[PDB]
Amino acid sequence: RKLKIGITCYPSVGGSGIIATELGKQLAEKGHEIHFITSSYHPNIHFHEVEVNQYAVFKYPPYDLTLASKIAEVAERENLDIIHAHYALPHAVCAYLAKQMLKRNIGIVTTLHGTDITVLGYDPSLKDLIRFAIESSDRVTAVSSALAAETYDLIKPEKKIETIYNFIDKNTAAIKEKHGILPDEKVVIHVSNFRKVKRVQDVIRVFRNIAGKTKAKLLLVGDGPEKSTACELIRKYGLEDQVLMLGNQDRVEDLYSISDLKLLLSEKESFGLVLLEAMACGVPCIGTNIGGIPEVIKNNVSGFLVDVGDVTAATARAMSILEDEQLSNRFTKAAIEMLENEFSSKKIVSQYEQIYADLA
Amino acid sequence: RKLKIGITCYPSVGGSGIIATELGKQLAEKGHEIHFITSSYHPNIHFHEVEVNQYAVFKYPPYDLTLASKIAEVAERENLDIIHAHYALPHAVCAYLAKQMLKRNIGIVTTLHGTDITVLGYDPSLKDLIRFAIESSDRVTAVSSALAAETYDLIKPEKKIETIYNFIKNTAAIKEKHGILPDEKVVIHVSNFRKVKRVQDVIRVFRNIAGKTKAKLLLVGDGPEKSTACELIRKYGLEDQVLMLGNQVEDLYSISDLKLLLSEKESFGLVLLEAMACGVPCIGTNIGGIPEVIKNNVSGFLVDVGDVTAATARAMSILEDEQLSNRFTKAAIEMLENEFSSKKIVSQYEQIYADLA
Ligand SMILES: CC(=O)N[C@H]1[C@@H](O[C@@H](CC(=O)O)C(=O)O)O[C@H](CO)[C@@H](O)[C@@H]1O
Numbered sequence: 001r002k003l004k005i006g007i008t009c010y011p012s013v014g015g016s017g018i019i020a021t022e023l024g025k026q027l028a029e030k031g032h033e034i035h036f037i038t039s040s041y042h043p044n045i046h047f048h049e050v051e052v053n054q055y056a057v058f059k060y061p062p063y064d065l066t067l068a069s070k071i072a073e074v075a076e077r078e079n080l081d082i083i084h085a086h087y088a089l090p091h092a093v094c095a096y097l098a099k100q101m102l103k104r105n106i107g108i109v110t111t112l113h114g115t116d117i118t119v120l121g122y123d124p125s126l127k128d129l130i131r132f133a134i135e136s137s138d139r140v141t142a143v144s145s146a147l148a149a150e151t152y153d154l155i156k157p158e159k160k161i162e163t164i165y166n167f168i169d170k171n172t173a174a175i176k177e178k179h180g181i182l183p184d185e186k187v188v189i190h191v192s193n194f195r196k197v198k199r200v201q202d203v204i205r206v207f208r209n210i211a212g213k214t215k216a217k218l219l220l221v222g223d224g225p226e227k228s229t230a231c232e233l234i235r236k237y238g239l240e241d242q243v244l245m246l247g248n249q250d251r252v253e254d255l256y257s258i259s260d261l262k263l264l265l266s267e268k269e270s271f272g273l274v275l276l277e278a279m280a281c282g283v284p285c286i287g288t289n290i291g292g293i294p295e296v297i298k299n300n301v302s303g304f305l306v307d308v309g310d311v312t313a314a315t316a317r318a319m320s321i322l323e324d325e326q327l328s329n330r331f332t333k334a335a336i337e338m339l340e341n342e343f344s345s346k347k348i349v350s351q352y353e354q355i356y357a358d359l360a
Numbered sequence: 361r362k363l364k365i366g367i368t369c370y371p372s373v374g375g376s377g378i379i380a381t382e383l384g385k386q387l388a389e390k391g392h393e394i395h396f397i398t399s400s401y402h403p404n405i406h407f408h409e410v411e412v413n414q415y416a417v418f419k420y421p422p423y424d425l426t427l428a429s430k431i432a433e434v435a436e437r438e439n440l441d442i443i444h445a446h447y448a449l450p451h452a453v454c455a456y457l458a459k460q461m462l463k464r465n466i467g468i469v470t471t472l473h474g475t476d477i478t479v480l481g482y483d484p485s486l487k488d489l490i491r492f493a494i495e496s497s498d499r500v501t502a503v504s505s506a507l508a509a510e511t512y513d514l515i516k517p518e519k520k521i522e523t524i525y526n527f528i529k530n531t532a533a534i535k536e537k538h539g540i541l542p543d544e545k546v547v548i549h550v551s552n553f554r555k556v557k558r559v560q561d562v563i564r565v566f567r568n569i570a571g572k573t574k575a576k577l578l579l580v581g582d583g584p585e586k587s588t589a590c591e592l593i594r595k596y597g598l599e600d601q602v603l604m605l606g607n608q609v610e611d612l613y614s615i616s617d618l619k620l621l622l623s624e625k626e627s628f629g630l631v632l633l634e635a636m637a638c639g640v641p642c643i644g645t646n647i648g649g650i651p652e653v654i655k656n657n658v659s660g661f662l663v664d665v666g667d668v669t670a671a672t673a674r675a676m677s678i679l680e681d682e683q684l685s686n687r688f689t690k691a692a693i694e695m696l697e698n699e700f701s702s703k704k705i706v707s708q709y710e711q712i713y714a715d716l717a
């Protein structure tokens with residue numbers, strides 16, 4: 001049965017935004033009627049805008065209250081069966097308030113992406129609010145089992161948290177030519193928001209060890225607070241010519257397509273959607289053995305996992321992969337099979353769809 | 361029964377923040393345990409602060425969620441019987457969330473001061489939220505019967521809204537400090553200078569007065585429309601006859617002969633009670649709660665919104681009839697000790713808390 005699903009999220013802040021929007025499109029293609037309720041296409045996809053109108057009275061812009069009001073407005077006017085929030089805070093709480101205002105039993109689905117753990121590390125006193133958010137949702141999913149376990153540890157809600165993974169939606173010569181890459185050169189890639197937990201310094205010390213060993217370029221893709229930290233480490237090591245600070249990019253597939261190695265060396269990472277994208281483009285990955293990364297990369301099967309801060313071992317693995325087309329190609333092969341099965345959008349979208357069917 | 365009472369509000373937005381804090385003081389002086397939960401001498405009174413950050417996750421700082429979190433935290437820890445919110449938005453909604461988070465029952469008291477009407481004017485989409493806030497509080501109060509009625513007419517909450525009112529020198533030296541000479545009459549206006557205060561109307565009225573008698577004008581406070589005000593002054597060349605002060609106010613009330621409040625929207629007008637208490641006769645507009653404070657021709661005058669003509673005539677009667685001025689003044693102070701006394705009102709809020717606890 002076609003359903004009418006509200007989706008409330010930050011429009012696009014990397015991973016979760018991409019996921020939420022793609023999930024909406026895919027559902028639309030199966031005949032559901034999708035209403036995005038955010039800040040900010042198909043006949044069945046509609047957009048409703050949360051606009052904050054602070055002219056007086058409010059000391060801070062009442063975006064949470066405004067969002068809740070808008071969810072309830074759209075829920076009533078469009079007869080929504082489901083509101084699917086992404087993040088506990090603020091979105092599940094806003095969905096909750098909206099349900100209370102509506103005075104009917106709309107189903108609330110909440111997807112945890114890891115940001116509630118982050119927020120909690122800066123302000124531990126939010127624990128009970130996050131627990132509330134979870135416990136007030138009808139069904140709760142997490143993008144990895146590790147995240148679900150960390151939520152149970154730190155939040156301890158009375159709620160089943162179901163694991164539903166993330167998913168993803170040629171002329172490499174030309175692309176290398178554009179970025180002035182020589183057919184001669186190995187290509188290492190890293191795509192992130194350059195926040196401290198991404199440990200970009202570890203990516204550069206790994207790369208530096210690499211490029212003192214073979215003809216190599218690093219593609220640094222993204223923007224964020226530790227970018228100036230990055231440059232500095234690059235200049236300190238004198239790798240200015242061998243690194244393409246590419247800042248944030250369009251057509252990220254082009255960059256993964258030219259690359260031979262993807263590194264994600266985070267200390268915190270609930271999933272790592274950039275791993276799937278590198279996988280889909282045939283790039284073997286080295287990730288840290290933390291969060292949900294071991295659920296994506298299986299060590300010495302579809303990639304390598306290292307310890308946080310282990311630049312030495314990451315360098316060893318990098319070389320192993322770069323020098324050996326055998327290993328690289330079997331890693332690559334194993335990874336594509338994961339993509340076609342555990343991480344395919346047909347499979348994940350139908351897991352979310354089943355949730356909605358259950359509640360409707 | 362001594363009680364543990366949480367108070368959440370914006371701690372000094374002008375009038376409502378004075379009321380909420382004074383109310384706290386009065387309850388602590390009768391020995392209840394008071395806990396302020398806000399942004400921000402007695403020891404039955406404590407303070408809890410909310411800190412609000414984006415942390416690179418939140419698009420905006422989630423004041424409302426952090427505050428609701430803190431209320432739940434304080435309520436649990438200190439076993440609060442009551443959380444008394446001032447304003448439906450955000451504060452009653454934050455109290456509601458906290459209550460829902462709490463295992464304990466807790467009584468939610470919300471007092472309306474009229475800002476929720478202001479919010480609704482700017483954003484008509486928040487009507488249902490505001491109605492929800494009101495309906496989800498256990499007991500709701502409004503600082504005038506006019507506000508209670510307008511709330512009902514505009515928001516239509518099905519909830520009882522109970523009227524509980526607001527409550528409350530060397531003049532030579534002070535006048536000297538301000539270059540006010542001893543034969544100058546002194547008109548005063550105290551506000552936040554918002555459009556609904558109609559400071560332009562205050563200034564027209566004053567021009568008329570300063571044209572009929574030797575007069576200064578104390579314009580006290582700050583706000584967007586202060587600039588509007590200054591231009592109107594220059595447009596009439598009254599620069600020299602106006603003192604523009606920010607906030608520091610009793611001193612000024614004591615050197616004044618007449619207080620004007622000519623708003624088009626005013627749920628109560630706390631400045632009125634401060635003026636009255638300092639022996640200053642008031643002229644107010646005939647809207648909102650101002651007719652609940654001023655008795656026309658008895659404890660001041662009331663006029664129609666915008667009626668600069670009527671306002672000038674009343675002003676002149678006051679300024680040149682010491683008899684009238686003194687009778688207004690005495691009647692206003694008797695009202696103060698009866699209807700607007702802190703002893704009375706504070707006991708009214710207590711009865712609410714007793715019922716719920
Ligand atoms: C810190 C963290 O756990 N970030 C996860 C989280 O990343 C956040 C962004 C962030 O890192 O704060 C997001 O994308 O909304 O969600 C992604 C999508 O599910 C994951 O791929 C990221 O691992």
Ligand SMILES: CC(=O)N[C@H]1[C@@H](O[C@@H](CC(=O)O)C(=O)O)O[C@H](CO)[C@@H](O)[C@@H]1O
Nearest residue numbers: 374375376473474503626627628629630
């Ligand atoms: C516009 C309005 O109704 N303002 C009332 C309202 O004033 C607001 C400030 C304002 O919005 O004017 C406040 O103090 O929070 O509350 C006061 C205390 O109850 C009343 O004295 C004012 O009449």
